[PDB]
Amino acid sequence: GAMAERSLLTGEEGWRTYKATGPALSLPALVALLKGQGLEVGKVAEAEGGFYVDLRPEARPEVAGLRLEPARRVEGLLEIPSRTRRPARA
Ligand SMILES: [Cl-]
Ligand SMILES: [Cl-]
Ligand SMILES: [Cl-]
Ligand SMILES: [Zn+2]
Ligand SMILES: [Zn+2]
Ligand SMILES: [Zn+2]
């Protein structure tokens, strides 16, 4: 199980918002990387300081070389939080 958690991006329960702050990554590179660790990826939003990305509260994400920490504040958003497009929809 896991303690109850809410997205800082959307307010939806069932998500913990992380911030990805390095190294340089495109959004699709970040999402492919996380999916590659078997992580279910929720909504994402590009920001000035990096990317906000929702992961499941059970997750304890570890991606080598990536700084991925629980977000403290949502700021500097450049776009609405949205789910990544599946290839059929892209
Ligand atoms: Cl927990
Ligand atoms: Cl791409
Ligand atoms: Cl933060
Ligand atoms: Zn929290
Ligand atoms: Zn949802
Ligand atoms: Zn975008």
Residue numbers in the entry: 421 to 510
Task: Quote the original article.
To visualize the structure of the C-terminal tail of the Hera_RBD, we crystallized several constructs and mutants of Hera_RBD. Two of the mutants, Hera_RBD_K463A and R444A/R449A, yielded structures with their entire C-terminal sequences visible in the electron density maps up to aa 510. In all structures where the C-terminal part is ordered, residues 493-498 fold back onto the outermost β-strand β2 of the RBD and physically block the RNA-binding site (cyan and orange in Figure 5A), with exception of the wild-type Hera_RBD structure. Although the point mutations are likely responsible for the different crystal forms, they do not per se impose this particular conformation of the C-terminus, and only the far ends of the C-termini extending away from the RBD are dictated by crystal contacts. The C-terminal part of the RBD can therefore adopt at least two major orientations, distended from the RBD or attached to the β2 strand. The last residue visible in the distended conformation is Leu498, the Cα atom of which is 22 Å away from its position in the ‘attached’ conformation. Mutants were grouped into three classes according to their Kd values: (i) with no or only a moderate (<5-fold) effect on RNA binding (K439A, R487A and R492A), (ii) with an intermediate (5- to 10-fold) effect on RNA binding (R444A and Y472A) and (iii) mutants that showed a >25-fold increase in the Kd values (R449A, R444/449 A, K463A and ΔC-tail). Only the mutation of A452 had an effect on RNA binding (10-fold increase in Kd), suggesting that α-helix α1 mainly contacts the RNA through the positively charged side-chains of R444 and R449. Altogether it can be concluded that the C-terminus of Hera_RBD exhibits considerable conformational plasticity.
